Write a protein that binds this ligand. Structure first.
Ligand SMILES: COc1ccc2c(c1)C=C1Cn3c-2c(C2CCCCC2)c2ccc(cc23)C(=O)NS(=O)(=O)N(C)CCCCN(C)C1=O
Length: 549
């Protein structure tokens, strides 16, 4: 079974494509012009051999799934989960019509749903497009490819599966399900799991082109888990029909409506992508841990992103065991890109593109937090400054990386400076968190941050020398002014925000307290504990077309 087959029709754009900004020669956005390069990478044969460990784990997973009772969402509910700028239907209505419950949209959606009950076999058409993502040069990344069904189908997926994909992974995987954690909760789990071992070893495992390694068997095993839920009859049939007609594979159509080929692996743009990937990664890895005889494994899975922390049995012993792990994973159809390295320092493990590092609070107590190399964040921030973007990655990065030296010194200072200069401070902006779109007001940051990271996110200091160097290195490389310039700029943004009063004075006070030396005594913000953040860190939805507001 080939992950893809191709006809020769191009992966076409549907609108003009900018590759560069209008050191800025280092930043680029991917385009359909590099799609052939990606097609080559993601196209291969999958050989899969299942063993007893795999089957044991699956049954364990299904017994936990069998506690779940999932609800069918109403049309209205599913419509309201649709992002305002979601791709329009080929049937002559758009996302705004869906959210408005326009007659044509609803009647098409109802027709798609009935067709899932009435047709159990006919492959559902999908669109394949090159994704536009910004990066900094190293070699140069080709465009990722996105594969998604029509809008009417996506609304139907929600109806059948939103509650399942939102509830089941935690039911099945418990503390291992990564998307239930805010960054502080994630860091807490990572450090506690590290501290709980007598002699800890840990590694990240990077599967090469995970979506393509996902087999038809994998996707039906996934369905077998969903089917353990108590389901409405129509939900059960829709899940079965969606599985056979969409999830396992189908025809690929370009933006010009030409047939590009055929898919027999995971679609990146379906509701079940994150959940499916998570369950599948967790299944294979847990089995592989047993095959390798890894002792007292604790794992954390976020889709295809995997970290395992375990008991060390000695250096040479662990190496041997990682190799057994990787061989088992490979048998399961998940060979690695980079071979995995055993790690005896928690900070040296990168997972969800992040590592643990340490700073100190105002009292000088150690505080663990999550950080990353800031190159991509800053590149995307630069792009977003210059060109209009719907999804503001800078706002997501400030939220998720609030405690970091770079998020605070550069990102807050820069964007608050711009918002101040355009008087667009209260203006709500979309951003993605674990794949779900969120509309957020910049002036609401300080409360959001206390509730996600604690008050210590405003008082961290005495950062790691290695973290310090990575940030300063990054700035010189990208031509960004050094931290001393950002401290001068923070002081100016701070004074202005304070003088605005209201929610601006709050931002100024809490967000830029680091910039001044005679510091202010920060104490809990009232509206922070009162903030409703339900459904924020509940599940992953990359590619699932989900909007929360
Ligand atoms: C590889 O992709 C990147 C990454 C970073 C930058 C850029 C491209 C584009 C850049 C450099 N740059 C960049 C940023 C980023 C920092 C993070 C937030 C987005 C902007 C600057 C911020 C201030 C400044 C300059 C910043 C800044 O104030 N620079 S400056 O010396 O005072 N100068 C007077 C302003 C020039 C504007 C920057 N510029 C032309 C760039 O090409």
């Amino acid at each position: 079974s080939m992950s893809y087959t191709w006809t020769g029709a191009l992966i076409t754009p549907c609108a003009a494509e900018e590759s560069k900004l209008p050191h800025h020669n280092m930043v680029y956005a991917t385009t359909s012009r590099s799609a052939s390069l990606r097609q080559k990478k993601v196209t291969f044969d999958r050989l899969q051999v299942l063993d007893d460990h795999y089957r044991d784990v699956l049954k364990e997973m299904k017994a936990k799934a069998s506690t779940v009772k999932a609800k069918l969402l109403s049309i209205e509910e599913a419509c309201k989960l649709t992002p305002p700028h979601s791709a329009k239907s080929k049937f002559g209505y758009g996302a705004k019509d869906v959210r408005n419950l326009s007659s044509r949209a609803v009647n098409h959606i109802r027709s798609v749903w009935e067709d899932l009950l009435e047709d159990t076999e006919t492959p559902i058409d999908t669109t394949i497009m090159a994704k536009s993502e910004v990066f900094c040069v190293q070699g140069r990344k080709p465009a990722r490819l996105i594969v998604f069904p029509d809008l009417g189908v996506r609304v139907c997926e929600k109806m059948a599966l939103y509650d399942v994909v939102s509830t089941l992974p935690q039911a099945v995987m418990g503390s291992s399900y990564g998307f239930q954690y805010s960054p502080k909760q994630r860091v807490e789990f990572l450090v506690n799991t590290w501290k709980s071992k007598k002699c800890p070893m840990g590694f990240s495992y990077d599967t090469r082109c995970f979506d393509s390694t996902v087999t038809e068997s994998d996707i039906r095993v996934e369905e077998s888990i969903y089917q353990c839920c108590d389901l409405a009859p129509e939900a059960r049939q829709a899940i079965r029909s969606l599985t056979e007609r969409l999830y396992i594979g189908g025809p690929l159509t370009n933006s010009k409506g030409q047939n590009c080929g055929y898919r027999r692996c995971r679609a990146s743009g379906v509701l079940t992508t994150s959940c499916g990937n998570t369950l599948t990664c967790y299944l294979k890895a847990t089995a592989a841990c047993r095959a390798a005889k890894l002792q007292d494994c604790t794992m954390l899975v976020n889709g295809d992103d995997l970290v395992v922390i375990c008991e060390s049995a000695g250096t040479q012993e662990d190496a041997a065991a990682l190799r057994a792990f990787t061989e088992a994973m490979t048998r399961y159809s998940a060979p690695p890109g980079d071979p995995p390295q055993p790690e005896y320092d928690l900070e040296l493990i990168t997972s969800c593109s992040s590592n643990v590092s340490v700073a100190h609070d105002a009292s000088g107590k150690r505080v663990y937090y999550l950080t990353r190399d800031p190159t991509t964040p800053l590149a995307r921030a630069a792009w977003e400054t210059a060109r209009h973007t719907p999804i503001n990655s800078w706002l997501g990065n400030i939220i998720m990386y609030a405690p970091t030296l770079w998020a605070r010194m550069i990102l807050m200072t820069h964007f608050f400076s711009i918002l101040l200069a355009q008087e667009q401070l209260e203006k709500a902006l979309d951003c993605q968190i674990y794949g779900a779109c969120y509309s957020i007001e910049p002036l609401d940051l300080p409360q959001i941050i206390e509730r996600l990271h604690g008050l210590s996110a405003f008082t961290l200091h005495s950062y790691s020398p290695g973290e310090i160097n990575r940030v300063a290195s990054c700035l010189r490389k990208l031509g960004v002014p050094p931290l001393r310039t950002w401290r001068h700029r923070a002081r100016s943004v701070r004074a202005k925000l304070l003088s605005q009063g209201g929610r601006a004075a709050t931002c100024g006070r809490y967000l830029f307290n680091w910039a001044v030396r005679t510091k202010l005594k920060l104490t809990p913000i009232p509206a922070a504990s009162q903030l409703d953040l339900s459904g924020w860190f509940v599940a992953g939805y990359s590619g699932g077309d989900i909007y929360h507001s």
